Design a protein around this ligand. Structure first.
Ligand code: MG
Ligand code: MG
Ligand code: MG
Lengths: 244, 240, 231, 212, 235, 222, 204, 232, 195
């Protein structure tokens, strides 16, 4: 019958590894690099679009950085279509929480929920996992600014600075070298762009190959503002930091 | 629905999916449990391959199931969350219907039952997780420590370890733990737990977590400095 | 070979190997004999023990006051099929105030076994059954195969070494069919028939199992000292 | 119907009448209104006879399964809640039940829970349920003390049912007495109200209104 | 791969035959039926000295008149025990009586072949079900994952089963006392166990009409072990 | 509006002796003021030395008896031909009745037989399954006419020993099967006189250790 | 008993020259009993304003529902929902409960951010849209409001004149309704400024 | 739950020494309107059974189809379908009774009163009643509706108890049935003059008589009856 | 159940609830505590249909305790009240609605403010300085409207509460057997054992 054609997506290897999770991680290692850096006065999200074209409409394009709500955003590394499925589910989860408790969802609770969905696909259902790794940048009044990552296994961890996608080994070493705890957003912006500039597989890092975002309390008084950078604004920050 | 029998017997009478789930536990960071005369201590290894980690928000290795019971684990981190959630729901369900919090044995029996179920249900794989469940029964001062594994078998232990290099730390515990006289104080119990992890851990810095559970819902996690003082005192006695 | 992985696959010569393997389980089973006259129908079964401490596995199951069977092969499958027969006999009595015809009981067993030979996921039944009964058309004996094939016979045998008993009944055909109004002599013929299938072992008091149904005889099973009379 | 149960120094006294009526017609004078759930737990019958019998027998099965699984006697709290949660599922369907779940354990001591078919579950010291409850309450309230002896407590329960049996037309027949201890309940006999009334009248000097 | 409910060319279910191999790896359990009661004994087989051996529960009560011992993948037994207990209690609810030991055993064995592609595989554990009822007296049954159950005068299951069964072949007779059975289980357990038998790595239990099912204290078993040692040294 | 219930009249009577039990019932079946049948058996031998009658709405009565007889058959299949004791039958009938708690069998059920000590036993059920072991129980149309008479003549209620004037009760001496049958016949003869739904015939099933025996008696047909 | 008049309250909306106004009373009651004088019945999602009269639990539920839906709308559309689009969303959402409806009388008010056109709309409890040019009324004093608005209203009122008209419409209507009053709020809405004014009124 | 629309009135029947007789008129009433005058309400099943049905005609036609299907089904894989394994009156009744009681238990009854008349394999007379409530009973005489009130008293004068059955010939039984049908025509406002009669005898088998009429009617005495009291 | 009162003062919330349980003809109990602690700084009192009240209250308690363990964090009174409102709003369109009215008294540790929420069985939520359910407000609100100040001490709140109970005991036909009074503040929940 049908058994013959079943790949069995949810089985251990003899070494105790999940084949499909490992192979999904291999897929993600070829995706454009995404970097998150947490500072005392905000968070930076920086990400490289994959070998683009001059005819691509950049100002209306979004493949890396997505808004989950007013307080939480994500950087994507992997299959964009898979990511959008999960992103929509996360957006709904945040709204369900807001309706139930009349308070914005704490960052970790959202991250745990999405990570649990990923986990389910590795244990039951016989379906392939989502070939997506997220960096979550968010703020709540309990822990303040937070960075998380999740991968196809459904495992998630918290970070001060982190990278996903291509050349994470090189990127993480560079971040580990220059990151400090008392760092500020403007410094983190520079670190993120410098790290991408060195780890990129492209010849040079330009505005049309980047997506950029910040989460700042640089919102007038006791509130948080998300800023998805426009193409011209990415071009300006590249000149300001002295990369172009 | 997906109904495929993933966990099945082999000619030699082995269920490889359950055995391969144990190999996932072997890969997981080391966890250790030691019960004194009036306490239980849960020690956990943190691999220092991951720095730049935010330790405030990163999922802690020891989890409260109720105010009086805790659960640590070795193996797949994502898998452990599902068991922890189910255990927490069952703990509240027990309080709601029986009007009494779970015993440590009951909670263990439940978690172990969930694990077993996933070894002979269609379309699911076993949990790649072994757990150490510790605490005190309501209105009881006798320490409790149990262990579960992917197959769903569970048992009580005076002291036990799971995860990578658990063979080595079990070796240590077997020669250092005396049943006739268990660690009489919190200090002695924590010291023996830190000592057991120092056989395997590497640096005694942020690699060792310690959680102390005492009777009547008295649970506290030791800080870096508090643990560092144990690490310091152990090696200074060793230089002799 | 490449075509015996499941029941849903014909071989190149048009065979169903899983059904044939299920048939093989019957051949490994202990011998049981069935035979009838015009007034009575008899089952004789050689029960098998695990060892000297163990009991002898029961072979004969009652389905109604007027019907029952003996099994050879997987005993749990016989329990499933006999339970189904009990229900069907019972449905007929409750709804139609009618005792289920033995021939119709055979048709129902055929159809139930057939569904397990044409669908994916399932498996054939691993047991053979000898159904006896007395209904409005007199005494009957049926042989059930888990292929679905049900056959009405004067006498037969299934299980290991059943060929010896079957040849004996084929010789004795003209004699035992005429044993009317004499239950003891009909059982004797059945005990003599099953004796042609014995090697090394003989019929003891906890070894032998006999059942009978007839004109004014409800289906009753004889075990223990009740069969010492026939040893 | 008149059923009562009260906590005291020596445990619990359970007392009930024995009459069942269908309208004015007295169907039975020999009804067992104490349900022996198990050797340690008692329940009382009021409202629907079948509902009480069926579900409190069922409760005994659940209690037995609990102690097999947990290797420990079920608490009165847990036992009563199994019943109240069950009837609460059926709420609106038309179950009729007013019962006292009575037991004596180590951790709790003597405990009584009034359980009821609209989902009520009340722990208490004295409960009275049924058409004749108001008559029994009068005798109970005016004579109850915690430091009653087992002998006097048994009589108080008996006398309170008698009061109800006399005045309430739908109560009577006979009085069944039980004493619940930590080691289990003890049955204290069936007492015909007809014979009991005259006996109590003479010995006590009560019921002067009635000619004997 | 191949079906879970597949027959071999010999007419056996692969999965059932493979589960029997898992039971062979299990710790030894022995049962002996007498006219004074049925005795059940097990090898605990703790994997480490730090494992508290009294938490090893391989002998279990089903009802007051029915006990049960297990061997193999013991985690699989839990749902079987749950079903047995429920079946025993349910029958008492429906019929105001004790359930027959055979009927209880048959109910447990009905679960066995409910696997396919219901549960995903057979049980990897064998059960010795011992009990008493008014109709057939003291009884001992061996419940297998095949769905078959045999009644036994005495039976051993687990890793030392064929050696123990040969020993039970010689020792059992129809006039055994309860005390004689207790010592006999201890003797044969001691023979097949890897480690030296004591009250902490072996457990006894019995079922009598009067007292019902009882698991023996370690102090009670320790005395029977000492009584065994002396009577073997007596010749 | 459709009324799923009806009333087929009839009166039944169970009495438990020392080593026997009788279950009697009239053979008249009615609707409103019409007679359906002068002889429609109402008390049934259900096997295992148990006799049963489910009086009231005859359709529900026949259904219950049919299902109980079926339960006896399956009890034999499932439990190695074990005899179903009267107490076990009674508990089983409770579950059959309570299964339709919210759409009840509109009947009053009585079973009779011997307990496991060989003593006479009668069990009485309400429509939804509440039951009890009783010594004496009349059911159906003329139950209110019969029970007071049985209280007086079986249990000797309100009867005291002459000369004592209320001080000493009449002692409860055991009744023979012949004595019980006399009281049954007189109960039904009296009920026939004063109740319009009672008449035509009386069928009595007597249970002893030897088995079940039947006796039939004519009743007035007006 | 009647779910639409248990809690009481009123909402009125009006159009003016390059502006809209929406106003409501502040009462929440349990029939005769006054329970709250701070129960505002006007909400806003971006620049679109929604007033809701009727059963107070449904008022709260629907506000939470439309906040939910307009937040998801914004994340996907990358822009704030407009009054015309939101009106259709309210209608769709109400009608999906056709045979188990929310017992409410919603009122939409706002200015289209692209065209600058003032917009108001009203609904019955199951979603039928009333898109009036002049005014929309809702609540337990809707008759009174219809009377006030019909006489007081004139087209193309300036924001500060429209304020007086809608305020006097609400106040005098509320004072002839037992279940309305206990305070009042008026929103004056222009293309990129909104002013909110609490009115002084009798407290009986 | 429904209401009967098109209805058939009484079915009457009795046992005699060698078999049973059953009869029913050919009317299908629509309330007080005598709408349909050619309705056959006696339906034979094989050569040994006749099922007589009163009440709702749409449900009667459904039952008629069930019985037709029952004969088809019984013949399947049945070499003795016309011999030892033919349908008995007792099988047919028990089936109908099961259906009737099941349907009332779902609160959706077949709105009928049914009498199954026939002769068993061993020559025994079969006569049993079942209705919309699933109520069943047997008697030497059986009748539905008005027949219960008027026919039974007359038929019971012929066969008053079981012992009268062997003393009752087919001529006496048929005579009593025919007279009862005349009485019902005099007194039942929902009856017709035309009726069918069926005899099932253990010797002569099934005799089915159609297009019978009520005859020998007394009406002449009506001419003398004038006014309602004082009028001459 | 009958009378449940609430008053939010300067630094605490005070809930007063009657002790009587009446089943038709008789008062079965006179010491019933019509409240549940949802979290260390959040208390819920309740009144309504028999059975449903306690069933609902314990169901809410179980859910809040579950949240507390999962997140190792106490939800704000506002968050708890919103959760409770949704459950009741969900319930009112169910097959058989919870006929339960509640008051939620909590101390917000983040804002350092007491908070009182009144929610009826329909899911009608309001935050109030003082509140009641049933007929309790009809007798007590005129007194509360007169005497209440937002800067009242806990002791003054209790005195105003006594006056409300005295007016209830005078003009209410039913004997509610006095009230159990509990105080919710920064230190948690405590019961006033003499009232
Ligand atoms: Mg009469
Ligand atoms: Mg007003
Ligand atoms: Mg006013």
């Amino acid at each position: 019958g049908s058994r013959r054609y079943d790949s069995r997506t949810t089985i251990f290897s003899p070494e105790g590894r999940l084949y499909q999770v490992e192979y999904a991680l291999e897929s993600i290692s070829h995706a454009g690099t995404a970097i998150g850096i947490m500072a005392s006065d905000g968070i930076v999200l920086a990400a490289e679009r994959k070998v683009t074209s001059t005819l691509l409409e950049q100002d209306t394009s979004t493949e890396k950085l997505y808004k989950l709500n007013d307080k939480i955003a994500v950087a994507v590394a992997g299959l964009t279509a898979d990511a959008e499925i999960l992103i929509n589910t996360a957006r709904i989860h945040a709204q369900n929480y807001l309706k139930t408790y009349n308070e914005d969802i704490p960052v970790e609770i959202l991250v745990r929920r999405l990570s649990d969905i990923k986990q389910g696909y590795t244990q039951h259902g016989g379906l392939r996992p989502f070939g997506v790794s997220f960096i979550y940048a968010g703020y709540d009044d309990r822990y303040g600014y937070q960075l998380y990552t999740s991968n196809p296994s459904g495992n998630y961890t918290g970070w001060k600075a982190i990278s996903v996608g291509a050349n994470t080994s090189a990127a993480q070493t560079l971040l580990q070298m220059d990151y400090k705890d008392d760092m500020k957003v403007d410094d983190a912006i520079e670190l993120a762009l410098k790290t991408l500039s060195k780890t990129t597989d492209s010849s040079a890092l330009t505005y049309d190959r980047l997506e950029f975002a910040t989460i700042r309390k640089g919102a007038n008084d006791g509130e948080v503002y998300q800023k998805i950078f426009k193409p011209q604004e990415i071009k300006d920050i590249l000149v300001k930091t002295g990369i172009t | 629905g997906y109904d495929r029998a993933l966990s099945i017997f082999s000619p030699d009478g082995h269920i490889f999916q359950v055995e391969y789930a144990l190999e996932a536990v072997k890969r997981g960071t080391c966890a250790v449990g030691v019960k004194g005369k009036n306490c239980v201590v849960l020690g956990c290894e943190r691999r220092s391959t991951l720095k730049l980690q935010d330790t405030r928000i990163t999922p802690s290795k020891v989890s409260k199931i109720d105010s009086h019971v805790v659960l640590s684990f070795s193996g797949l981190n994502a898998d452990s969350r599902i068991l922890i959630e189910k255990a927490r729901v069952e703990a509240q369900s027990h309080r709601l219907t029986l009007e009494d919090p779970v015993t440590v044995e009951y909670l263990t029996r439940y978690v172990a039952g969930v694990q077993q179920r996933y070894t002979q249900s269609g379309g699911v794989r076993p949990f790649g997780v072994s757990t150490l469940i510790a605490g005190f029964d309501p209105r009881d001062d006798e320490p409790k420590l149990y262990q579960t594994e992917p197959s769903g078998i569970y048992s009580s232990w005076s002291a036990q370890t799971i995860g990578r290099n658990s063979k080595t730390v079990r070796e240590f515990l077997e020669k250092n733990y005396d049943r006739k006289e268990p660690p009489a104080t919190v200090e002695e119990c924590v010291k023996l737990t830190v000592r057991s992890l120092l056989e395997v851990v590497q640096t005694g810095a942020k690699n060792i977590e310690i959680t102390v559970v005492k009777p009547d819902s008295d649970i506290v996690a030791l800080s870096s400095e508090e643990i560092n003082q144990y690490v310091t005192q152990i090696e200074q006695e060793k230089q002799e | 070979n490449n075509y015996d992985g499941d029941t849903v696959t014909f071989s190149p010569t048009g065979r169903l190997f899983q059904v044939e393997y299920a048939l093989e389980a019957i051949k490994q089973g202990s011998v049981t004999v069935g035979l009838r006259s015009n007034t009575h129908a008899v089952l004789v079964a050689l029960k098998r023990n695990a060892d000297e401490l163990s009991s002898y596995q029961k072979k004969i199951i009652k389905c109604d006051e007027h019907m029952g069977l003996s099994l050879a092969g997987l005993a749990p499958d016989a329990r499933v099929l006999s339970n189904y027969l009990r229900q069907q006999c019972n449905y007929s009595s409750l709804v139609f105030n009618r005792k289920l015809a033995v021939e119709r009981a055979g048709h129902l067993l055929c159809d139930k076994a057939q569904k397990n030979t044409q669908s994916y996921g399932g498996r054939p039944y691993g047991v053979g059954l000898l159904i006896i009964g007395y209904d409005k058309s007199g005494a009957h004996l049926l042989e059930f195969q888990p292929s679905g094939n049900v056959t009405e016979l004067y006498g037969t045998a299934i299980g290991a070494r059943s060929q010896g008993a079957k040849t004996y009944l084929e010789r004795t055909l003209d004699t035992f069919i005429k044993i009317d109004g004499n239950p003891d002599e009909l059982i004797k013929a059945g005990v003599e028939a099953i004796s042609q299938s014995l090697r090394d072992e003989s019929l003891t008091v906890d070894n032998l199992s006999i059942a009978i149904v007839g004109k004014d005889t409800p289906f009753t099973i004889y075990d223990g000292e009740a069969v010492a009379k026939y040893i | 119907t008149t059923t009562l149960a009260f906590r005291f120094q020596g445990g619990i006294i359970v007392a009930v009448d024995s009459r069942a009526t269908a309208g004015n017609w007295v169907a039975s004078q020999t009804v067992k209104k104490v349900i022996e759930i198990n050797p340690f737990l008692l329940g009382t019958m009021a409202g629907g006879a079948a509902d009480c019998q069926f579900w409190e027998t069922w409760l005994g099965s659940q209690c037995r399964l609990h102690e097999l699984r947990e290797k420990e006697r079920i608490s009165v709290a847990a036992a009563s809640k199994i019943l109240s949660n069950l009837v609460y599922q059926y709420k609106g369907a038309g179950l009729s039940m007013g019962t006292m779940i009575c037991g004596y354990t180590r951790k709790e001591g003597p405990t009584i829970y009034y359980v009821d078919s609209d989902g009520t579950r009340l722990k208490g010291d004295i409960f009275c349920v049924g058409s004749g409850q108001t008559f029994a309450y009068g005798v109970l309230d005016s004579n109850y003390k915690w430091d009653l002896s087992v002998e006097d407590a048994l009589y108080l329960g008996k006398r309170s049912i008698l009061a109800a049996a006399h005045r309430n037309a739908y109560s009577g027949g006979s009085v069944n007495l039980y004493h619940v201890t930590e080691d289990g309940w003890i049955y204290h006999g069936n007492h015909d109200v007809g014979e009991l009334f005259w006996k109590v009248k003479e010995e006590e000097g009560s019921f002067n209104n009635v000619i004997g | 791969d191949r079906g879970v409910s597949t027959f071999s060319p010999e007419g056996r279910l692969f999965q059932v035959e493979y589960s029997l191999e898992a039971i062979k790896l299990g710790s030894t359990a022995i049962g002996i039926a007498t006219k004074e009661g049925v005795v059940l004994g097990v090898e605990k087989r703790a994997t480490s000295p730090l494992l508290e051996s009294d938490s090893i529960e391989k002998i279990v009560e089903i009802d007051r008149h029915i006990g049960c011992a297990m061997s193999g993948l013991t985690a699989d037994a839990r749902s079987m025990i749950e079903h047995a207990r429920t079946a025993a209690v349910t029958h008492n609810l429906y019929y105001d009586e004790d359930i027959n030991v055979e009927s209880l055993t048959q109910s447990v064995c009905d679960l066995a072949l409910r696997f396919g592609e219901l549960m995903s595989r057979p049980f990897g554990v064998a059960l010795l079900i011992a009990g008493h009822d008014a109709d057939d007296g003291y009884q001992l049954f061996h419940a297998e994952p095949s769905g078959t159950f045999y009644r036994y005068n005495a039976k051993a299951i687990g890793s030392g089963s064929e050696g123990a069964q040969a020993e039970l072949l010689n020792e059992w007779h129809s006039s055994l006392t309860l005390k004689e059975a207790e010592l006999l289980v201890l003797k044969i357990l001691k023979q097949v166990m890897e480690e030296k038998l004591d009250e902490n790595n072996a457990q006894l239990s019995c079922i009598t009409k009067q007292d019902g099912f009882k698991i023996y204290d370690n102090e009670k078993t320790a005395e029977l072990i000492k009584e065994l040692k002396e009577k073997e040294a007596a010749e | 509006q459709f009324n799923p219930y009806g009333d087929n009249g009839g009166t039944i009577l169970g009495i438990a002796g020392e080593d026997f039990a009788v279950l009697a019932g009239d053979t008249r079946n009615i609707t409103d003021y019409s007679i359906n049948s002068r002889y429609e058996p109402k008390v049934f031998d259900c096997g295992d030395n148990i006799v049963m009658s489910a009086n009231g709405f005859a359709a529900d009565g026949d259904a219950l008896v049919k299902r109980f007889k079926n339960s006896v058959k399956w009890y034999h299949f499932d439990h190695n031909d074990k005899k179903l004791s009267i107490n076990s039958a009674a508990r089983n009938i409770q579950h059959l009745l309570y299964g339709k708690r919210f759409f009840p069998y509109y009947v009053h059920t009585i079973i009779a037989g011997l307990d496991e000590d060989g003593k006479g036993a009668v069990y009485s059920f309400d429509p939804v399954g509440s039951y009890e072991r009783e010594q004496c129980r009349a059911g159906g149309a003329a139950a209110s006419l019969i029970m007071p008479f049985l209280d007086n003549q079986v249990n000797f209620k309100n009867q005291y020993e002459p000369g004592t004037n209320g001080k000493v009760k009449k002692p409860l001496k055991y009744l023979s099967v012949e004595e019980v049958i006399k009281l049954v016949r007189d109960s039904f003869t009296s009920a026939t006189e004063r109740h319009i739904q009672v008449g035509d015939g009386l069928e009595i099933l007597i249970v002893t250790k030897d088995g079940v025996r039947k006796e039939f008696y004519e009743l007035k047909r007006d | 008993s009647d779910p639409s008049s248990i809690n009481g309250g009123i909402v009125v909306a009006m159009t003016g020259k390059d502006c809209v106004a929406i106003a409501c009373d502040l009462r929440l009651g349990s029939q005769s009993l006054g329970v709250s004088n701070k129960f505002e019945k006007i909400f806003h999602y971006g620049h679109v304003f929604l007033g809701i009269t009727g059963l107070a639990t449904d008022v709260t539920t629907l506000n939470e529902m439309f906040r939910y839906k307009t937040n998801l709308y914004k994340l996907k559309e990358e822009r704030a929902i407009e009054p015309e689009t939101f009106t259709q969303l309210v209608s769709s959402s109400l009608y999906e409960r056709r045979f188990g409806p929310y017992f409410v009388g919603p009122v939409v008010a706002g200015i289209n951010s692209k065209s600058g056109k003032p917009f108001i709309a009203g609904f019955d409890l199951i979603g039928c849209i009333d898109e009036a040019k002049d005014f929309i009324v809702s609540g337990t004093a809707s008759d009174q409001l219809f009377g006030m608005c019909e006489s007081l209203y004139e087209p193309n009122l300036e924001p500060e004149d429209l304020f007086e008209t809608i305020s006097q419409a609400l106040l005098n209507a509320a004072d002839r309704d037992a279940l309305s009053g206990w305070g009042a709020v008026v929103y004056i809405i222009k293309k990129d400024e909104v002013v909110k004014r609490y009115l002084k009124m009798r407290q009986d | 739950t429904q209401q009967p629309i098109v209805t058939g009135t009484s079915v009457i029947s009795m046992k005699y020494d060698n078999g049973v007789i059953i009869a029913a008129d050919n009317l299908g009433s629509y309330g007080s309107l005598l709408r349909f005058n050619g309705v056959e309400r006696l339906i034979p099943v094989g050569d040994n059974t006749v099922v007589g049905i009163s009440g709702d005609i749409s449900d009667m036609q459904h039952i008629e189809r069930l019985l037709k299907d029952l004969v088809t089904e019984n013949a399947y894989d049945n070499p003795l379908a016309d011999a030892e394994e033919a349908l008995e009156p007792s099988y047919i009744f028990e089936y109908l009774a099961t259906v009737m009681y099941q349907r009332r238990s779902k609160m959706n009854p077949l709105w009928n009163a049914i009498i199954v008349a026939g002769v068993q394999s061993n020559g025994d007379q079969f006569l049993r009643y079942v209705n919309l409530l699933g109520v069943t009973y047997s008697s030497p005489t059986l009748a539905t509706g008005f027949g219960a009130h008027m026919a039974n008293p007359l038929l019971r004068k012929v066969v008053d108890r079981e012992s009268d059955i062997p003393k009752t010939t087919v001529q006496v039984a048929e005579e009593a049935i025919v007279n009862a049908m005349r009485v019902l025509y005099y007194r039942d406002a929902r009856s017709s003059r035309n009726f069918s009669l069926a005899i099932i005898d253990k010797n002569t088998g099934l005799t089915f008589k159609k297009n019978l009429q009520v005859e020998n009617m007394k009406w002449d005495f009506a001419k003398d009856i004038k006014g309602y009291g004082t009028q001459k | 159940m009958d009378i449940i009162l609430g008053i939010r003062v300067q630094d605490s919330v005070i809930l007063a609830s009657s002790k009587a349980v009446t089943r038709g003809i008789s008062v079965l109990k006179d010491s019933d505590d019509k409240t549940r602690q949802l979290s260390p700084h959040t208390l819920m009192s309740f009144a309504g249909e028999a059975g449903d009240t306690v069933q609902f209250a314990e169901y809410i308690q179980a859910n809040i305790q579950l949240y507390s363990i999962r997140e190792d964090y106490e939800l704000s009174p506002q968050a708890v009240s919103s959760f409770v409102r949704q459950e009741l709003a969900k319930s009112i369109r169910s097959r058989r609605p919870y006929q339960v009215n509640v008051l939620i008294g909590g101390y917000d540790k983040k804002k350092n403010k007491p908070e009182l929420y009144q929610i009826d069985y329909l899911g009608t939520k309001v935050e109030l300085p003082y509140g009641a359910h049933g007929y309790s407000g009809f007798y007590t609100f005129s007194l509360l409207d007169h005497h209440y100040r937002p800067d009242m001490t806990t002791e003054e709140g209790l005195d105003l509460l006594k006056l409300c109970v005295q007016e209830l005991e005078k003009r209410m036909p039913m004997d509610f057997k006095g009230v159990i009074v509990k105080i919710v503040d920064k230190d948690g929940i405590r019961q006033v054992d003499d009232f």
